Amino acid sequence: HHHHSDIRAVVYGVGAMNSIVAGMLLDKGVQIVGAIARSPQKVGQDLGDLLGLGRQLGVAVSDDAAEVLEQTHPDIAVIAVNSYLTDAVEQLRICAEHGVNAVTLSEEMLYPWETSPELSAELDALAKSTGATLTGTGYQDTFWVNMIALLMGTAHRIDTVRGKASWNVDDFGPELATAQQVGRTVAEFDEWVRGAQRPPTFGRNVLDALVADTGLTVKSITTATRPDIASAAMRSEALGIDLAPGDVIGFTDIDRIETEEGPVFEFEMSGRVYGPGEGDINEWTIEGEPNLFLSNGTVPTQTTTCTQMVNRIPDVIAAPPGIVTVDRLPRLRYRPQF
Amino acid sequence: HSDIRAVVYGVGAMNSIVAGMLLDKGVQIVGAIARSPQKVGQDLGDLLGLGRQLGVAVSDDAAEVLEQTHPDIAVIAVNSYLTDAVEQLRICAEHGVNAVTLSEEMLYPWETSPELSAELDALAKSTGATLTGTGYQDTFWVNMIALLMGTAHRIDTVRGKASWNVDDFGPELATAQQVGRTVAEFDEWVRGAQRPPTFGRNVLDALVADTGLTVKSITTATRPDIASAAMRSEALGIDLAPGDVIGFTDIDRIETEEGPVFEFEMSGRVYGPGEGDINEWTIEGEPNLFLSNGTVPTQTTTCTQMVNRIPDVIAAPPGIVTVDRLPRLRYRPQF
Ligand SMILES: NC(=O)c1ccc[n+]([C@@H]2O[C@H](COP(=O)([O-])OP(=O)(O)OC[C@H]3O[C@@H](n4cnc5c(N)ncnc54)[C@H](OP(=O)(O)O)[C@@H]3O)[C@@H](O)[C@H]2O)c1
Numbered sequence: 057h058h059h060h061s062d063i064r065a066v067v068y069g070v071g072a073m074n075s076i077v078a079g080m081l082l083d084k085g086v087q088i089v090g091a092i093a094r095s096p097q098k099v100g101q102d103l104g105d106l107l108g109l110g111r112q113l114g115v116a117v118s119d120d121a122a123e124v125l126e127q128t129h130p131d132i133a134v135i136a137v138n139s140y141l142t143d144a145v146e147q148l149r150i151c152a153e154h155g156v157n158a159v160t161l162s163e164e165m166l167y168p169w170e171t172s173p174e175l176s177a178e179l180d181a182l183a184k185s186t187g188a189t190l191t192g193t194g195y196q197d198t199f200w201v202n203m204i205a206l207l208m209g210t211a212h213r214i215d216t217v218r219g220k221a222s223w224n225v226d227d228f229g230p231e232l233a234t235a236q237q238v239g240r241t242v243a244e245f246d247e248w249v250r251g252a253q254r255p256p257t258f259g260r261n262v263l264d265a266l267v268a269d270t271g272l273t274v275k276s277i278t279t280a281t282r283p284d285i286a287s288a289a290m291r292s293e294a295l296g297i298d299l300a301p302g303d304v305i306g307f308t309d310i311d312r313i314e315t316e317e318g319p320v321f322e323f324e325m326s327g328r329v330y331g332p333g334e335g336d337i338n339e340w341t342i343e344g345e346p347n348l349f350l351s352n353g354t355v356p357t358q359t360t361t362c363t364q365m366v367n368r369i370p371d372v373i374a375a376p377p378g379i380v381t382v383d384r385l386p387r388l389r390y391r392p393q394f
Numbered sequence: 395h396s397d398i399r400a401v402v403y404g405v406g407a408m409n410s411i412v413a414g415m416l417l418d419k420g421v422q423i424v425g426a427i428a429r430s431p432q433k434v435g436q437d438l439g440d441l442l443g444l445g446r447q448l449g450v451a452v453s454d455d456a457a458e459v460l461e462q463t464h465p466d467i468a469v470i471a472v473n474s475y476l477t478d479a480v481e482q483l484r485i486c487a488e489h490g491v492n493a494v495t496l497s498e499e500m501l502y503p504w505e506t507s508p509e510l511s512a513e514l515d516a517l518a519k520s521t522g523a524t525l526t527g528t529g530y531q532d533t534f535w536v537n538m539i540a541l542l543m544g545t546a547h548r549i550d551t552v553r554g555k556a557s558w559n560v561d562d563f564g565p566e567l568a569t570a571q572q573v574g575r576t577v578a579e580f581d582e583w584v585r586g587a588q589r590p591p592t593f594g595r596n597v598l599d600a601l602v603a604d605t606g607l608t609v610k611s612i613t614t615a616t617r618p619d620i621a622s623a624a625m626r627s628e629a630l631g632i633d634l635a636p637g638d639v640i641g642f643t644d645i646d647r648i649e650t651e652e653g654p655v656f657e658f659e660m661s662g663r664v665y666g667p668g669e670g671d672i673n674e675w676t677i678e679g680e681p682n683l684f685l686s687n688g689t690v691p692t693q694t695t696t697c698t699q700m701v702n703r704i705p706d707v708i709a710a711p712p713g714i715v716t717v718d719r720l721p722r723l724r725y726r727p728q729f
């Protein structure tokens with residue numbers, strides 16, 4: 057039933073991901089009571105019209121997050137706006153100040169304690185003072201953290217945990233495409249990647265979560281990034297731009313954490329514009345006793361980004377106040393209704 | 395070194411591997427139970443070829459070993475079906491001893507053996523003991539599949555396909571898989587009124603119960619796996635002729651009132667050279683999902699999962715506690 061759930065939600069950002077999320081919230085019976093955007097064209101429009109549902113929702117998109125929360129006091133803010141706590145702290149402060157629970161796609165919020173310790177401590181204290189839970193989730197929740205820790209649970213001895221992942225820029229919106237340096241020159245890329253304040257890699261937060269969940273001690277952290285290059289003329293649907301042979305179309309990171317206790321963790325991740333025939337991958341190997349393998353074939357990264365944030369909403373409402381990371385939440389479960 | 399004091403109940407193919415893993419985790423082996431007169435009185439360390447004696451003499455008297463050692467946990471690798479396993483599980487529950495077992499039916503026995511399940515659950519609760527079926531299925535057929543299901547918006551069908559090798563395991567399992575029988579002997583056996591429940595039926599009962607759904611329909615079928623060429627079974631030390639039964643393949647299906655359908659095909663047979671174990675699962679719905687574990691190490695992860703479960707089973711409430719209800723399985727270098 058359309059609004060069968062007690063849960064009242066604000067959709068914070070209305071981009072590629074929250075457009076999908078909004079439709080899934082309605083399918084679960086969640087009541088959408090508010091919607092926050094930045095583009096002037098979008099403010100004032102009905103969310104239902106803006107998402108191209110044949111029904112109006114009776115929700116007018118606002119450009120004023122604090123005003124929407126003060127007017128609606130939702131159970132949950134569902135955030136798909138940015139990646140790094142340096143940016144995301146602005147939206148997460150507004151949620152926590154108003155005692156509003158927040159689930160966010162911010163990749164750094166997956167496990168932010170090590171990469172952004174000051175902002176993490178600040179947000180955790182604020183959220184605790186107002187009874188609110190803040191949780192970073194998305195694709196990584198199952199496919200790079202909880203399913204990998206579960207696979208590790210079948211090992212007697214672990215020497216190395218190795219992950220390899222590929223996702224398509226053109227499955228996502230301009231925020232991520234621009235952050236992946238799509239359409240930049242190699243010279244622009246080299247200045248950016250060497251920059252003093254380059255954000256932490258998505259994979260660093262993944263490995264911090266696995267190391268912390270396993271209860272191990274960091275001995276050494278290393279990282280490297282190279283641009284992904286167009287081999288021929290391509291187009292980015294995410295930015296609506298032509299890409300010439302030699303243009304940057306994304307990048308590949310490799311992150312590595314050695315533990316004092318012996319296990320080594322390594323994760324290579326490419327986020328780039330795909331040409332025809334390319335597909336996402338999720339491939340993990342454990343070297344030890346025994347050797348283990350996990351693959352998810354052409355893994356639906358885009359859809360499971362959105363399903364995981366949605367299926368987390370009851371967990372995040374029910375969880376203790378503060379920053380609660382997905383390794384500490386109960387097992388993610390299939391729920392037709394909320 | 396661990397506080398955990400364990401009795402290794404059965405000393406066959408799987409408990410021989412398990413014993414060495416228990417020692418690696420720092421678990422104290424305080425007793426060992428066998429059936430064979432040949433094994434009784436031997437030091438467990440000698441019997442397993444550890445190259446140190448353990449100071450533990452194998453006994454054929456389970457009750458006596460439990461009364462004498464009062465272990466935290468009995469680690470059972472003896473048999474599969476509650477009809478058999480109730481004998482060892484009664485001795486553990488009577489003595490208030492926690493038990494982790496490889497018994498495949500104990501993965502989720504409530505529907506296939508409701509009377510024996512109720513009896514054992516009541517007895518274990520009266521003495522403060524936890525009884526838990528685990529092994530290979532725990533992660534690869536139940537908990538990892540329920541986790542994958544957690545990423546679906548809508549599920550139409552959950553479909554599994556699994557292969558394991560009889561010759562990775564001991565005579566108990568090889569004999570129960572009808573290895574070396576004729577097709578006519580197999581057809582009489584498989585049609586029998588008291589044929590035990592399929593391993594896969596217990597898998598699907600667990601997934602359906604974990605998802606909180608309602609059974610509408612249960613179907614099952616079995617066919618023998620046939621030698622296409624001359625083979626040998628190392629498990630039974632027998633030559634197998636073209637046309638001989640070398641194991642069997644089950645297909646189990648549960649339709650739910652709510653819509654989702656579960657299906658699981660499992661083959662347990664003697665392998666020829668080049669064959670490998672498989673674990674391949676598909677979820678049809680929104681979205682479509684896939685999981686594969688390559689040439690999955692079924693033999694090693696049978697033993698690692700029972701070992702890695704021991705802290706969970708000690709800490710769990712008394713009664714039959716199924717692995718879908720336990721906290722997430724975790725890697726622990728030391729117990
Ligand atoms: N964890 C994961 O697996 C995962 C997966 C996919 C994406 N993400 C992350 O989620 C974020 C969003 O991705 P996307 O594909 O949806 O990008 P997108 O299409 O660019 O959407 C971003 C949205 O944020 C809005 N916005 C920007 N600043 C805002 C503010 N101060 N207040 C309210 N709204 C604001 C934009 O508004 P307008 O529409 O009005 O411009 C836009 O709707 C990115 O950082 C991406 O990296 C994470």
Ligand SMILES: NC(=O)c1ccc[n+]([C@@H]2O[C@H](COP(=O)([O-])OP(=O)(O)OC[C@H]3O[C@@H](n4cnc5c(N)ncnc54)[C@H](OP(=O)(O)O)[C@@H]3O)[C@@H](O)[C@H]2O)c1
Pocket residue numbers: 403404405406407408409427428429430433471472473474496497498528529530531562563564565566567696
């Ligand atoms: N859940 C799973 O993933 C999984 C995986 C592998 C195996 N299993 C099951 O685990 C069981 C054992 O497998 P295995 O490969 O280790 O078989 P195995 O080598 O035949 O070992 C069976 C053991 O049971 C012992 N035994 C029989 N009756 C006994 C009793 N009353 N008290 C104490 N010991 C007794 C036998 O002792 P003697 O040697 O002294 O005759 C033998 O050592 C089989 O039922 C198999 O189906 C389950």
